[PDB]
Amino acid sequence: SQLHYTVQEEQEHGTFVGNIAEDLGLDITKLSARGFQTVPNSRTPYLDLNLETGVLYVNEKIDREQICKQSPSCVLHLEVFLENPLELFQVEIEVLDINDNPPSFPEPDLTVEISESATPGTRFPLESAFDPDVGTNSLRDYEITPNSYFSLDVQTQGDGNRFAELVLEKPLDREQQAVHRYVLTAVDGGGPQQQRTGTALLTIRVLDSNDNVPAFDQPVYTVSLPENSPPGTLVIQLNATDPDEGQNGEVVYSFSSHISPRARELFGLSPRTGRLEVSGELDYEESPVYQVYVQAKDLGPNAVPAHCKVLVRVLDANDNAPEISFSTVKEAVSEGAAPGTVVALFSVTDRDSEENGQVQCELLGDVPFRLKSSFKNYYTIVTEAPLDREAGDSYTLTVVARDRGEPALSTSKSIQVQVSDVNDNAPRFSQPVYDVYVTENNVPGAYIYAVSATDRDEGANAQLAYSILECQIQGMSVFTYVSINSENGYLYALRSFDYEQLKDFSFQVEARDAGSPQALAGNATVNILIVDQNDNAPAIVAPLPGRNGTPAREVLPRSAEPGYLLTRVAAVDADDGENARLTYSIVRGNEMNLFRMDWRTGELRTARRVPAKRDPQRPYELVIEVRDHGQPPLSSTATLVVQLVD
Ligand SMILES: *[C@@H]1O[C@H](CO)[C@@H](O[C@@H]2O[C@H](CO)[C@@H](O[C@@H]3O[C@H](CO)[C@@H](O)[C@H](O)[C@@H]3O)[C@H](O)[C@H]2NC(C)=O)[C@H](O)[C@H]1NC(C)=O
Ligand SMILES: *[C@@H]1O[C@H](CO)[C@@H](O[C@@H]2O[C@H](CO)[C@@H](O)[C@H](O)[C@H]2NC(C)=O)[C@H](O)[C@H]1NC(C)=O
Ligand SMILES: *[C@H]1O[C@H](CO)[C@@H](O)[C@H](O)[C@@H]1O
Ligand SMILES: *[C@H]1O[C@H](CO)[C@@H](O)[C@H](O)[C@@H]1O
Ligand SMILES: *[C@H]1O[C@H](CO)[C@@H](O)[C@H](O)[C@@H]1O
Ligand SMILES: [Ca+2]
Ligand SMILES: [Ca+2]
Ligand SMILES: [Ca+2]
Ligand SMILES: [Ca+2]
Ligand SMILES: [Ca+2]
Ligand SMILES: [Ca+2]
Ligand SMILES: [Ca+2]
Ligand SMILES: [Ca+2]
Numbered sequence: 024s025q026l027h028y029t030v031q032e033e034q035e036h037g038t039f040v041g042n043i044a045e046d047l048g049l050d051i052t053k054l055s056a057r058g059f060q061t062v063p064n065s066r067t068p069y070l071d072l073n074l075e076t077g078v079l080y081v082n083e084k085i086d087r088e089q090i091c092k093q094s095p096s097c098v099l100h101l102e103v104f105l106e107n108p109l110e111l112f113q114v115e116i117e118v119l120d121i122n123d124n125p126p127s128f129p130e131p132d133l134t135v136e137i138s139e140s141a142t143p144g145t146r147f148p149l150e151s152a153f154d155p156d157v158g159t160n161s162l163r164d165y166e167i168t169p170n171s172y173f174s175l176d177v178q179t180q181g182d183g184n185r186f187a188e189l190v191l192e193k194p195l196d197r198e199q200q201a202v203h204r205y206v207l208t209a210v211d212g213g214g215p216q217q218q219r220t221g222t223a224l225l226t227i228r229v230l231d232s233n234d235n236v237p238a239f240d241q242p243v244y245t246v247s248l249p250e251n252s253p254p255g256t257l258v259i260q261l262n263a264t265d266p267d268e269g270q271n272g273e274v275v276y277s278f279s280s281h282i283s284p285r286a287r288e289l290f291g292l293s294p295r296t297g298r299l300e301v302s303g304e305l306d307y308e309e310s311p312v313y314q315v316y317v318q319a320k321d322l323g324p325n326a327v328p329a330h331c332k333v334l335v336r337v338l339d340a341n342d343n344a345p346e347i348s349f350s351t352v353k354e355a356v357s358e359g360a361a362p363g364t365v366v367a368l369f370s371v372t373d374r375d376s377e378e379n380g381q382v383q384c385e386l387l388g389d390v391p392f393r394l395k396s397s398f399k400n401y402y403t404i405v406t407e408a409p410l411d412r413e414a415g416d417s418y419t420l421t422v423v424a425r426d427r428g429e430p431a432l433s434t435s436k437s438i439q440v441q442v443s444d445v446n447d448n449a450p451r452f453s454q455p456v457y458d459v460y461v462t463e464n465n466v467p468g469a470y471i472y473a474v475s476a477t478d479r480d481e482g483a484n485a486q487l488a489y490s491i492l493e494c495q496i497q498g499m500s501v502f503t504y505v506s507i508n509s510e511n512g513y514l515y516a517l518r519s520f521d522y523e524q525l526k527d528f529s530f531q532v533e534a535r536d537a538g539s540p541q542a543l544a545g546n547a548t549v550n551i552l553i554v555d556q557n558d559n560a561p562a563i564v565a566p567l568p569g570r571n572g573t574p575a576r577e578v579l580p581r582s583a584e585p586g587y588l589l590t591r592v593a594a595v596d597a598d599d600g601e602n603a604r605l606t607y608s609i610v611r612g613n614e615m616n617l618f619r620m621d622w623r624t625g626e627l628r629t630a631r632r633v634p635a636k637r638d639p640q641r642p643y644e645l646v647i648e649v650r651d652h653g654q655p656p657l658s659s660t661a662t663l664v665v666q667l668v669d
């Protein structure tokens with residue numbers, strides 16, 4: 024027949040399986056005679072048959088998962104036989120499955136990826152666990168640690184196969200939590216029959232998507248910089264936040280097309296740092312404030328640009344020095360132009376602003392001009408005090424304009440004002456009065472003297488012409504004696520002067536200047552004094568001579584003594600001084616010192632008596648010399664007759 028038994032797996036060595044002999048009705052000891060034996064090819068290492076008793080034992084521990092591997096039916100087929108008579112028997116030992124194996128996952132560490140943009144209700148398949156046992160001891164269910172985000176959907180397909188699924192219950196946000204960690208378990212149907220459990224650690228990667236745009240913490244930024252800030256100066260460090268992952272979170276900055284081209288020139292913006300710096304010259308005088316239209320953009324797909332605006336206020340700095348500009352200037356200023364006469368006009372500018380653009384002026388020199396201002400920054404240069412061309416030839420006026428910044432800026436400009444001349448000085452003569460000494464009987468048409476004169480003014484106003492002012496001299500005109508060279512001022516004699524008739528005269532000589540508005544002139548006086556010269560000869564006036572060129576006869580008494588006075592000779596000279604001094608002498612007529620005559624007087628007196636002489640026929644006859652003491656010395660002589668009457 025069919026012999027049947029049932030036994031569990033993993034039974035101990037020696038476990039009772041079944042008594043073949045008893046189930047077949049053959050007594051214990053008759054078995055040995057009949058050749059009770061196991062067919063050789065049907066022997067299994069798992070079963071050992073005791074030939075003496077007919078009882079089956081487990082010989083090697085049976086592992087159902089090793090012999091059948093998930094087969095629904097696990098039967099071991101053995102065969103036994105007896106001899107005389109021959110009897111063959113099939114023996115089926117059905118192996119039963121026990122829950123000695125838990126379910127297991129091929130990957131104990133599992134990772135599934137989900138976009139943070141996943142719609143709830145979406146399902147995400149999962150690794151199926153494997154339980155090598157069969158039937159009620161195989162895979163029974165999946166469990167996930169309780170959470171809000173995911174649930175488990177277990178589906179059975181018939182086929183006794185149970186595989187799992189994830190169910191997203193709520194929307195994910197990678198920006199809040201990008202990694203989720205849950206425990207995944209699978210349990211079998213073991214209910215010591217008890218349940219076994221398997222595990223897989225579950226990790227959700229949350230995928231990113233460009234669901235955030237770059238964000239400026241302000242829509243408008245305002246920064247103030249000083250003008251002339253050096254290129255490279257930090258304007259502002261812009262910042263557009265994007266918490267996304269990777270390129271979706273990388274931001275790049277640029278200028279929006281709204282920006283003015285000028286600001287594009289003057290500003291540079293590093294597209295990756297967002298640093299906005301100066302790349303030109305900030306000229307407050309060109310514009311005081313600039314608009315920078317910036318846009319940021321993330322490098323993810325479907326990128327949407329963000330915007331912002333930086334307003335740069337330029338601070339004014341003192342970088343423009345004042346400029347001076349004369350409207351009109353004149354160099355022609357008269358000396359007699361009263362104080363207040365205008366000489367020049369000018370205006371000042373400073374293209375700065377605020378206190379940097381205010382200008383104050385000073386005139387340099389401590390000179391006879393003042394600055395006057397009606398409207399500020401419009402000026403006049405005027406005369407302070409009266410001018411004197413004779414004291415000031417020209418002038419150099421330098422104006423200095425200086426602004427009210429720090430550092431202050433100053434400019435200077437010079438104009439030269441030439442002092443014009445007026446005929447306001449009268450000529451003066453080298454001397455108030457001159458002394459001219461002229462020889463008697465001089466040369467007519469001769470240079471006798473020279474006069475000088477000087478005038479302080481300029482050119483014509485000091486060009487001199489000389490004159491002899493008309494007067495009267497010896498009953499007629501003064502031009503009869505002297506003429507003046509109207510250019511040189513020379514005094515010339517025109518006639519030979521006779522000291523005896525005229526000896527001195529005086530004329531007022533004049534010098535006029537070439538004055539066009541009003542001629543000016545001065546005068547002086549010249550005294551012509553006349554040297555006397557011995558041109559008159561002396562002549563005797565006493566004693567009076569005879570009729571017709573006949574000597575004077577003065578009687579000497581021969582009866583007379585030494586020192587006896589005869590008479591005195593008097594002469595005359597029309598000259599003056601040593602030219603009319605008079606001395607007297609005798610050359611011939613005296614005999615051995617018989618007579619004597621005085622140097623100055625001309626007195627004849629006897630030196631000695633008349634020895635050896637008594638009224639001789641031939642009387643004595645002297646010759647007397649009258650002389651003056653000038654050069655040339657002139658003389659005149661006379662004859663005397665001394666007759667002897669006692
Ligand atoms: C540009 O913008 C970014 C983002 O706004 C600024 O990042 C700032 O960075 C500091 C320093 O890393 C952050 O402080 C951090 O705090 C955490 C505490 O959670 C700490 O773990 C870190 O060690 C660090 O101390 C700060 O939160 C963050 N600021 C903001 C508003 O998020 C960056 O500073 C900006 N740069 C410029 C030049 O503007
Ligand atoms: C020659 O020059 C003298 C010096 O300038 C003249 O003297 C002046 O004469 C005026 C005319 O009356 C007087 O008012 C002034 O007081 C005089 N000046 C001085 C300094 O005393 C003089 O008049 C001139 N001669 C002539 C003929 O005109
Ligand atoms: C398998 O084992 C786990 C404990 O590790 C249980 O939670 C489960 O019910 C089954 O007994
Ligand atoms: C898998 O393993 C975990 C521990 O990692 C158990 O807690 C669970 O019951 C299953 O046996
Ligand atoms: C008068 O005459 C005498 C001579 O008689 C001269 O010597 C003198 O020089 C003057 O002419
Ligand atoms: Ca087993
Ligand atoms: Ca088993
Ligand atoms: Ca199992
Ligand atoms: Ca998000
Ligand atoms: Ca994102
Ligand atoms: Ca982004
Ligand atoms: Ca400037
Ligand atoms: Ca300026």
Ligand SMILES: [Ca+2]
Nearest residue numbers: 343375379426
């Ligand atoms: Ca200035």
Ligand SMILES: [Ca+2]
Nearest residue numbers: 411412413447
């Ligand atoms: Ca003058």
Ligand SMILES: [Ca+2]
Nearest residue numbers: 445446447480
């Ligand atoms: Ca003058």
Ligand SMILES: [Ca+2]
Nearest residue numbers: 448480484536
């Ligand atoms: Ca003059």
Ligand SMILES: [Ca+2]
Nearest residue numbers: 463521522558
């Ligand atoms: Ca004479």
Ligand SMILES: [Ca+2]
Nearest residue numbers: 556557558598
């Ligand atoms: Ca004379």
Ligand SMILES: [Ca+2]
Nearest residue numbers: 559598602651
């Ligand atoms: Ca004489």
Ligand SMILES: [Cl-]
Nearest residue numbers: 519520521524
């Ligand atoms: Cl004369």
Ligand code: NA
Nearest residue numbers: 170171173174
């Ligand atoms: Na849930």
